[PDB]
Every structure is written in structure tokens, then in C-alpha cells.
């Protein structure tokens, strides 16, 4: 186990070329937390309760924007030159219709 841990740490670390990312800035997943604590042999009842409470707190509620504009797009004629609404088009302002 000690040799395996040495090999895993050697594969993880690349300290000569750059630093390791800060854990306090990264975020990780409850699945990995559960599997690691299960390997360590602790009791996951309280952590599972916390995760279930967080999941039940994060509820997705649909709205009128989701009902109306949920699948659609555009609503605006996309310009040929990527111009804003009040931006001049030197090339195409003199030709009103798209056929011409």
C-alpha cells in the first residue's frame, strides 16, 4: 500500500514545472466524497442527509420565459455583417431588398 501511494502521488504531482491547484478554490463532488469516506470506513449517514437536503433545496421551477422562449431562438433578422441595430453598413445600406 505504501509503494502504491508513492506511485499515485508521483503520477499526481508535477511540481517542477508548475504548482498544484488550490483545494480552497477548487470544488469536488459528493459522489467522490462518499466513495472516499466509504473506503476510509466512516459513516455516511450525516453527509448523505446534508446532500439530500441540499438537493431538495436546489429546485428547478419553470417560468413563463421557459414556456415561451424555451426552445425558440432568433426573433431578430441576423445581419450579414454582424452589425448592431444603429450601426452603419457601408456596403449594404444602399440596397434595401435581399433579392437585389
Amino acid at each position: 500500500r505504501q509503494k502504491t501511494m508513492i506511485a499515485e502521488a508521483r503520477n499526481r504531482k508535477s511540481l517542477k514545472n508548475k504548482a498544484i491547484m488550490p483545494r480552497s478554490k477548487l470544488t469536488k463532488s459528493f459522489g467522490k466524497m462518499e466513495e472516499h469516506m466509504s473506503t476510509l470506513g466512516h459513516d455516511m449517514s450525516a453527509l448523505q442527509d446534508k446532500q439530500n437536503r441540499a438537493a431538495r433545496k436546489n429546485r428547478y421551477v419553470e417560468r413563463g420565459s421557459d414556456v415561451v422562449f424555451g426552445d425558440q431562438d432568433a426573433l431578430t433578422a441576423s445581419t450579414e455583417n454582424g452589425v448592431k441595430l444603429r450601426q452603419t453598413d457601408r456596403l449594404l445600406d444602399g440596397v434595401a431588398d435581399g433579392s437585389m
Partner: protein, 106 residues
């Protein structure tokens, strides 16, 4: 000169979630704090106590919060909690153990 400094650690969140042992943490501190360069030489110099949620270290011989953090991170690495639990300061000489940010699985 030799004014007694007090350092507190709050282990309540990992203890309540059931992944930490304050008695083992305090015993590790007792066995691994070095005075004048050696372990087991804490007699009448430093004292470590724990009541199940707060671990208190009262020292008169060259103890610092950075040293306490170093020892706590050694203990967390030994118990394989370094990737999930960190040691942070709330005010001067009072610290707590916190979890790293974890997203729900859903």
C-alpha cells in the same frame, strides 16, 4: 517573555458529520508537539485539552499558530482527510476545521 498564549481549534463540523476524532487529535498533538527540539518534553510548558468540540492548547514555550496548523495538517494527512478538510483561522489564535466546497450529486 513566557506569557501563556492560548490557541483554540473548533472541530465541531467534522465531528458532527462523523469523520473526525477530537480525542485522537488531542493525543496526536500531545505526542507530537516539540519543545526545545524534542517530543515528550511538554512538562509544565504546554497543555492540550479537549471537550469533544473544542481543542485548546495553552503554551508558554515557543508555540505558534502556523506550527499548530502544520501539525493539524500532518494529522489530517495521516488520517487521509487532507483532500476534504482544511484548517482555517476565524480570529487571532482561534481556528476551525472546515470542509472543502462539495456540490450535491442530485
Amino acid at each position: 517573555q513566557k506569557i501563556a498564549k492560548t490557541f483554540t481549534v473548533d472541530v465541531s463540523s467534522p465531528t458532527e458529520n462523523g469523520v473526525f476524532d477530537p480525542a485522537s487529535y488531542a493525543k496526536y498533538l500531545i505526542d507530537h508537539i516539540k519543545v526545545e527540539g524534542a517530543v515528550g518534553n511538554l512538562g509544565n510548558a504546554v497543555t492540550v485539552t479537549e471537550d469533544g468540540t473544542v481543542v485548546t492548547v495553552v503554551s508558554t514555550a515557543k508555540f505558534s499558530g502556523k506550527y499548530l496548523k502544520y501539525l493539524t495538517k500532518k494529522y489530517l494527512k495521516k488520517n487521509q482527510l487532507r483532500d476534504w478538510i482544511r484548517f482555517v483561522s476565524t480570529k487571532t489564535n482561534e481556528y476551525r476545521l472546515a470542509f472543502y466546497q462539495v456540490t450535491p450529486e442530485e
